[PDB]
Amino acid sequence: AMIVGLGTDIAEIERVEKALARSGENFARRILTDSELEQFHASKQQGRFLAKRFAAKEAASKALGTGIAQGVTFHDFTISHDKLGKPLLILSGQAAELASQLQVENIHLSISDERHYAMATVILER
Amino acid sequence: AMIVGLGTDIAEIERVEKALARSGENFARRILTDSELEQFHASKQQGRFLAKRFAAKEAASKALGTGIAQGVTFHDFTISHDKLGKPLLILSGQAAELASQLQVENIHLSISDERHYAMATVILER
Amino acid sequence: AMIVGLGTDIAEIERVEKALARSGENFARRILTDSELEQFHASKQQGRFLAKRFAAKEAASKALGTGIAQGVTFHDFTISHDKLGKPLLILSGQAAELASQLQVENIHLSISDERHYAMATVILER
Ligand SMILES: CC(C)(COP(=O)(O)OP(=O)(O)OC[C@H]1O[C@@H](n2cnc3c(N)ncnc32)[C@H](O)[C@@H]1OP(=O)(O)O)[C@@H](O)C(=O)NCCC(=O)NCCS
Ligand SMILES: CC(C)(COP(=O)(O)OP(=O)(O)OC[C@H]1O[C@@H](n2cnc3c(N)ncnc32)[C@H](O)[C@@H]1OP(=O)(O)O)[C@@H](O)C(=O)NCCC(=O)NCCS
Ligand SMILES: CC(C)(COP(=O)(O)OP(=O)(O)OC[C@H]1O[C@@H](n2cnc3c(N)ncnc32)[C@H](O)[C@@H]1OP(=O)(O)O)[C@@H](O)C(=O)NCCC(=O)NCCS
Ligand SMILES: [Ca+2]
Ligand SMILES: [Ca+2]
Ligand SMILES: [Ca+2]
Ligand SMILES: [Ca+2]
Ligand SMILES: [Ca+2]
Ligand SMILES: [Ca+2]
Ligand SMILES: [Cl-]
Ligand SMILES: [Cl-]
């Protein structure tokens, strides 16, 4: 019925690429869950892949009203896709607990990227 | 009621300008309906005009859940404005058929551009 | 509860910084209410602070459906924050009068910035 939260985020792709060039998997694993890493490792544009997931998760954390804090971690969010490529967001851990407290029934996520920037928006509704 | 789709897109204006300098009307006509072409032709900043429409339409195609695919074309989306300048989105063709299947009753669109980027967000609600 | 409006906006931070270097308070006071100026004055990154507020207010004005026109001014939008850092939008002046006529009961705002750009999205719900 009503919107419980709204979140948006923009990420500079070159910054994510630089971080991967320096710290690689140590950096990717802080952001991605084990299930997401398979898809990540398969990509030939890993910085772009990670930039999008980073924007999506930050946008989700803001829609929750906590950001990546108060027990909410990047691993509480998992990004997947439907059969036509639409991105989907699934919550776990503290994010799932807060969503339940807020009575969230539907989650909407959209992602976009151009050469230099990735962005995402998330809406939680009850 | 509830949100049935969310879409967002960011477009680099310079790439649109380069495409117009090379292919002009042939490129513009792939994105714009005949009705929209009249407004486009009267514009004195065509690359900027077209980048905004491009972002709006891709955002709308993501809100429908298909992208520009599965029979959904750029011509299935028409952008107009109300008397105060608010952008309005009207669907046709396969986009309209899918929206009808999604029970879409209200469509919201917002657009913004700065010197180098144009972006848009679309929300479909039932 | 349906969506009354949606607004989005992107702002180039260096343009805001340049404006401040030239016009300072004359510029800042056009965008910010006296109450918001207190927080602004305490910031050590005033250009970035102001770029975010500028984006939030422009987005809010688009969600209302008027833009910054028709008696609606930048001062009709006040950005505050909750204890966890979530941004909150409160309307006044003509914006509040119009929102009341539209039966707006819930307002949602999200803001994000990266090195060069600030962006925001606003949704008004009845
Ligand atoms: C908000 C967060 C997710 C992102 O921070 P950031 O990249 O500086 O944020 P962005 O510029 O995209 O967003 C800043 C805006 O987010 C919004 N925000 C902050 N806290 C929020 C909250 N609890 N809920 C919703 N929105 C929030 C605010 O509008 C803020 O700007 P403002 O304070 O001027 O209004 C933050 O919780 C965070 O970065 N936490 C730690 C993340 C981390 O571990 N980082 C290491 C890198 S892997
Ligand atoms: C999705 C589409 C609309 C835009 O493609 P794009 O510009 O590469 O996409 P963007 O970079 O803006 O966004 C990519 C994201 O869109 C989202 N997306 C993809 N398919 C989607 C769908 N069916 N529904 C909703 N969102 C979708 C995804 O999150 C994707 O990123 P991810 O796969 O890493 O999660 C695509 O269907 C398209 O444009 N197809 C035809 C190609 C075309 O005509 N191009 C223009 C030529 S002039
Ligand atoms: C909408 C406004 C807030 C910003 O316009 P802008 O600088 O062109 O900003 P953007 O590029 O971000 O937005 C343009 C889009 O906003 C949208 N828009 C315009 N009027 C709108 C309205 N009444 N309601 C909702 N959206 C609107 C349109 O989609 C427009 O693009 P289009 O005409 O190509 O479709 C406008 O009312 C304005 O500039 N007011 C004056 C603000 C001011 O005082 N500026 C001085 C600089 S401090
Ligand atoms: Ca961020
Ligand atoms: Ca892209
Ligand atoms: Ca795109
Ligand atoms: Ca502009
Ligand atoms: Ca603007
Ligand atoms: Ca930032
Ligand atoms: Cl234009
Ligand atoms: Cl700041």
Author numbering:
A (entry chain B), B (entry chain A), C (entry chain C): 0 to 125
Paper text:
The active form of ACP is produced by a post-translational modification of a conserved serine residue of apo-ACP by a 4′-phosphopantetheine (P-pant) group transferred from CoA bound to a holo-(acyl-carrier-protein) synthase (AcpS). AcpS belongs to the phosphopantetheine transferase (PPT) family of proteins, binds CoA and its derivatives and requires magnesium for activity. The AcpS trimer binds three CoA molecules and three ACP molecules.
24 polypeptide chains of AcpSVC are arranged in eight trimers in the P21 asymmetric unit. Whether the purification tag was present or absent, crystals of apo-AcpSBA and apo-AcpSVC only diffracted to low resolution.
